[PDB]
Design a protein around this ligand. Structure first.
Ligand SMILES: *C[C@@](*)(O)[C@H](CCCNC(N)=[NH2+])NC(=O)[C@@H]1CCCN1C(=O)[C@H](N)Cc1ccccc1
Ligand SMILES: *[C@@H]1O[C@H](CO)[C@@H](O)[C@H](O)[C@H]1NC(C)=O
Ligand SMILES: [Zn+2]
Ligand SMILES: [Zn+2]
Lengths: 251, 44
C-alpha cells in the first residue's frame, strides 16, 4: 500500500495474512468471507515463473493480527489450510485473467471484535456499486514503495474505480471483463495504490442499503506502484461468484 | 442480508457479514469511511 495510512484497530476484521511456513515468510493478503473460507489471489499460490506452486501444508494463515512483529494473544489466530482451490481458467501466462483462489481453513475460526467475515456482493449490489468514480477501499501489509519498506501496521487507502476505456489504455496487458482497475488520475491531486505484497488483499465498498462492507475485488496486478497515469488491477469478484459457489458446494 | 451459501458447506457468517464490531456494531464511523460515502454523491 503506497501513500496510504495506518489502519484503526478493527477497521478491517476480515484481513487475512497468507504466510509461508518454512521459511516463515509473509506472502500475500487475503480475506475472510466465512468462518472456514478465505479468499485470495490465484498468483499467490500458483505462479510457475516465480517458482510458486504451494500446497495445503506449505502455508498457514493469520487472522485478526494488528502489528507484524508482536504475537497478539487471544486477539490473533493462526489457522492451517485443509484445501486450496485455484480457478481452472486462471491465466498466469498472459494477463492474470481470473486471478482468484479459495482456501478452506482446517479448523473454523471464532469471530470476535477483531475477526469477522466480509460480504460477497449479489447481482444488485454489484451493478449498483461497481461504477467508475465511486471509491472503494484496499488494505495490505505490502510495500510502502517500490523496492520505508513494508509496514509494521496494516495499511489502508481508498481509491476511485476507473472507467474501462481508461484502464485499457494505461497498460499494454490484455485487460478482461473479469477485472477492473482503480486509482486517481494525475489531475486529481490524490495518490495511493496497492503494491507488491498486497495481492490477494480485498477491495471493499460500503453499501448504503444495509451499512455493510462488500468485497468487490481482489488485488491482482499493476505496473510499478502509484505511478502517474497508471492504475492497479483487481479481480472482479462478482463475475466469478458462480465459480466461488461451485467450489464451496463441492466442498 | 439474504443468502447465497449453504451454512453446512460454507460455515457460518454469510449473515454476520460486513459489520465491524468496533464500528457499525457500536454505531461508530471509521476515520475515512465518509470518503467512500461521499464518492456516491456524484460531482455535487
Ligand atoms: C503478486 C502481488 O503481490 C502483486 C500485486 C501488484 C499490485 N500492484 C499495484 N500497482 N496495485 N502482483 C504481481 O506482482 C503480479 C504477479 C505477476 C506479475 N505481476 C504484476 O502485477 C506485473 N508487474 C504486471 C503483470 C504481469 C503479467 C500479467 C499481468 C500483470
Ligand atoms: C504444481 O506442482 C505439481 C507437482 O507436485 C505439478 O503436477 C503441477 O503441474 C504444478 N502445477 C503447474 C506447474 O501449473
Ligand atoms: Zn491488538
Ligand atoms: Zn483517502
Amino acid at each position: 500500500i503506497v501513500e496510504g495510512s495506518d489502519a484503526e484497530i478493527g477497521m478491517s476484521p476480515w484481513q487475512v495474512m497468507l504466510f509461508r511456513k518454512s521459511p516463515q515468510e509473509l506472502l500475500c493478503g487475503a480475506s475472510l468471507i466465512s468462518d472456514r473460507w478465505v479468499l485470495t489471489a490465484a498468483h499467490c499460490l500458483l505462479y510457475p515463473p516465480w517458482d510458486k506452486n504451494f500446497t495445503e501444508n506449505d502455508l498457514l494463515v493469520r487472522i485478526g493480527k494488528h502489528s507484524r512483529t508482536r504475537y497478539e494473544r487471544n486477539i490473533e489466530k493462526i489457522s492451517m489450510l485443509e484445501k486450496i482451490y485455484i480457478h481452472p481458467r486462471y491465466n498466469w501466462r498472459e494477463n492474470l485473467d481470473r486471478d482468484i483462489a479459495l482456501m478452506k481453513l482446517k479448523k473454523p475460526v471464532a469471530f470476535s471484535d477483531y475477526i469477522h467475515p466480509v460480504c460477497l456482493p449479489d447481482r444488485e449490489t454489484a451493478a449498483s456499486l461497481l461504477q467508475a468514480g465511486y471509491k472503494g477501499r484496499v488494505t495490505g501489509w505490502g510495500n510502502l514503495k517500490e523496492t520505508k519498506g513494508q509496514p509494521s501496521v496494516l495499511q489502508v487507502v481508498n481509491l476511485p474505480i476507473v472507467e474501462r476505456p481508461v484502464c485499457k489504455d494505461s497498460t499494454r496487458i490484455r485487460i478482461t471483463d473479469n477485472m477492473f482497475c482503480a486509482g486517481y488520475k494525475p489531475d486529481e491531486g490524490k495518490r495511493g495504490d496497492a503494491c507488491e505484497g498486497d495481492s490477494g488483499g480485498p477491495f471493499v465498498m460500503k453499501s448504503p442499503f444495509n451499512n455493510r462492507w462488500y468485497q468487490m475485488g481482489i488485488v491482482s496486478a499493476g505496473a510499478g506502484c502509484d505511478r502517474d497515469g497508471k492504475y492497479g488491477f483487481y479481480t472482479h469478484v462478482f463475475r466469478l461468484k458462480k465459480w466461488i459457489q461451485k467450489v464451496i458446494d463441492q466442498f | 442480508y439474504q443468502t447465497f451459501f449453504n451454512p453446512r458447506t460454507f460455515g457460518s457468517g454469510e449473515a454476520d457479514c460486513g459489520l465491524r464490531p468496533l464500528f457499525e456494531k457500536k454505531s461508530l464511523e471509521d476515520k475515512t469511511e465518509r470518503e467512500l460515502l461521499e464518492s456516491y454523491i456524484d460531482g455535487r
